[PDB]
Symmetry: C2
Subunit: 361 residues, 2 copies
């Protein structure tokens, strides 16, 4: 990396304003003969909490939040994309508008950042960016691939799934995108399920004893009595009886098999706990469920809590192990012995590189 | 009301720290021969937003919040009960503790309020308070009733149901409460659900076309196509296939019928809104679902939104009417033609009178 990279390369700021927080990235890049970005490098990264949709939509609060997010960035005279996702999607447009009107005013009132867009993106655009970010990192975009790469983004309020699929006139146009990039034409199926991200879905199960370690104090005063297969069947009812995940996804995956699954988001954080034993930054659903059942669901909460003092979300690990299996195996139809790659959690990889690659007409 | 009522009567402050805001009440009362409150009178009420569990738990933020709640009260130098409910129950104890450590510090740092308790109450405790608050207002506590009174509290972040039921060795102790009030013994079944509060529930159905007016812009990019019976059937899957409300509740109401149903919380706001029409502060589930279907679900969103613009809640009324029906009829088993009384929303009635009457918890 150069010293003062934005004096030597194009630069853009992309903010991922998700349900749990907002993450600013500044990327430097060069461009190829078609003015498409190459050599994308992250030169700055800053996350603040809580989610933008969780703060009071008044000037003082929104102005303090943007200042906290942006003021200490090393370069400011660059284009900014502020893209909010599932936290903002939980709100009606009239409520979202209060946030964007105040944010727009804050950018208009300063003279360095160059706001391009500030908006709630759809889950479908977000899934496209999920797939572009991962495949950019895997270096599979420049040449036509012989294997199909699927991507899952496991967020706090939505989950996305995205994989190659030829155009299909029986499927909504909203769930398909024809990507042109580096001279190749890519057709993807995209889907986002709102309410199935980990925070939203956990709020359906907090008094389920099967979903928590033995003797964990549940909110209404009963005790955990963990059992991952039982917990998983409860979560599967939300996936398939309420949201119809398997009816929508499985027939398409059977017709368009994915050779390599990659995930970003929450799986990385769970699977990296010392409670688990994985190698090569990959897991299978059967191993995740078995290890969460043995190591967490069937262990005593006070012992776990004292033994893993730096696992902030330890109390949900039995639930999360069970939920990931419900979503991937019972929802998407992925075999429980299929390898799922997870991007190493130190990378904090999100969908933002997708915006660098896709934003131009 | 007296000039300073707390000079001649006992007064306490009760704060309902709920999901969308915190509401301070100051009550004056006298006590009867057993030191049980009578003549309870609300002498001050103030609601602030947002919910306590939504603010960042640091000293600057919590001082601004508690100042806004309490500093302009016309009376102070009284005991305070700060009881938080579902918004805080959605956080683990380790995270709640930061809030109460900061709140405890703020109270220690001042002189005007005497903090007695600041804690998250269970939904079972909240249900008992719901029942006591309504029955105190109905005057049914002092004497043995010929009728069974049931209460539902339709909250933002949980729902409660509570009704008389003799002590039952087969049911969890956590779902049964016994209390002696005005020298009478009262036994109640209590239950609360978080996943079924209005916020949590709604976050599972925002992409369901049946639950919004025609052409409403769903967040997934599809269009509303409202149909309240179909929306109700979708919400019933969360009630029964996920939460097993019917299996838990219906057998108990079959054995312990409720003669009069009262509700507090969101039903009152919906039913009193400009879009619905009910007489005598009561409704039937039949009529609620039909009104929502015709007055919201089957309308064109753009046109309806422009007709009723002072209305930021309207977008959700097809979903809410269908959800209330799914909860009451398909969950609890209530007959669609049974009267459900709702407390006039002008009263803003919450469960806090129950704390005046009952200082213990689970």
């Amino acid at each position: 990396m150069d010293t003062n990279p934005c004096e030597k390369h194009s630069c853009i700021a992309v903010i991922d304003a998700g349900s749990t927080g907002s993450r600013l990235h500044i990327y430097s890049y060069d461009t190829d003969d078609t003015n498409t970005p190459i050599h994308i490098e992250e030169i700055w990264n800053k996350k603040i909490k809580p989610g933008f949709a969780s703060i009071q939509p008044n000037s003082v609060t929104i102005d303090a939040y943007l200042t906290m997010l942006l003021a200490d960035a090393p370069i400011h005279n660059i284009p900014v994309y502020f893209y909010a996702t599932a936290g903002m999607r939980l709100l009606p447009q009239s409520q979202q508008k209060k946030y964007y009107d105040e944010l727009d005013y804050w950018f208009r009132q300063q003279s360095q950042w160059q706001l391009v867009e500030a908006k709630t993106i759809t889950g479908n655009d977000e899934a496209l960016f999920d797939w572009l970010a991962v495949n950019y990192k895997l270096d599979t975009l420049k040449s036509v691939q012989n294997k199909s790469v699927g991507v899952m983004d496991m967020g706090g309020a939505s989950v996305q799934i995205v994989f190659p699929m030829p155009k299909n006139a029986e499927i909504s146009k909203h769930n398909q995108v024809e990507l042109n990039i580096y001279g190749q034409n890519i057709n993807l199926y995209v889907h986002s399920f709102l309410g199935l991200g980990q925070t939203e879905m956990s709020h359906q199960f907090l008094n389920s004893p099967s979903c928590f370690a033995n003797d964990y104090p549940l909110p209404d005063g009963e005790s955990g009595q963990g059992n991952a297969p039982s917990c998983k069947e409860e979560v599967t009812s939300l996936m398939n009886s309420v949201h119809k995940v398997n009816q929508q996804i499985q027939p398409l995956l059977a017709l368009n098999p994915v050779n390599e699954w990659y995930s970003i988001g929450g799986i990385s954080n769970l699977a990296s706990s010392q409670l688990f034993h994985f190698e090569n930054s990959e897991l299978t659903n059967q191993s995740l469920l078995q290890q969460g059942d043995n190591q967490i669901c069937h262990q005593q909460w006070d012992i776990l809590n004292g033994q893993y003092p730096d696992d902030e979300y330890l109390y949900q690990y039995c639930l999360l192990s069970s939920y990931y299996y419900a979503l991937m195996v019972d929802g998407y139809g992925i075999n429980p012995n299929q390898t799922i790659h997870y991007i190493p959690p130190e990378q904090n990889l999100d969908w933002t590189i997708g915006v660098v690659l896709h934003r131009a007409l």
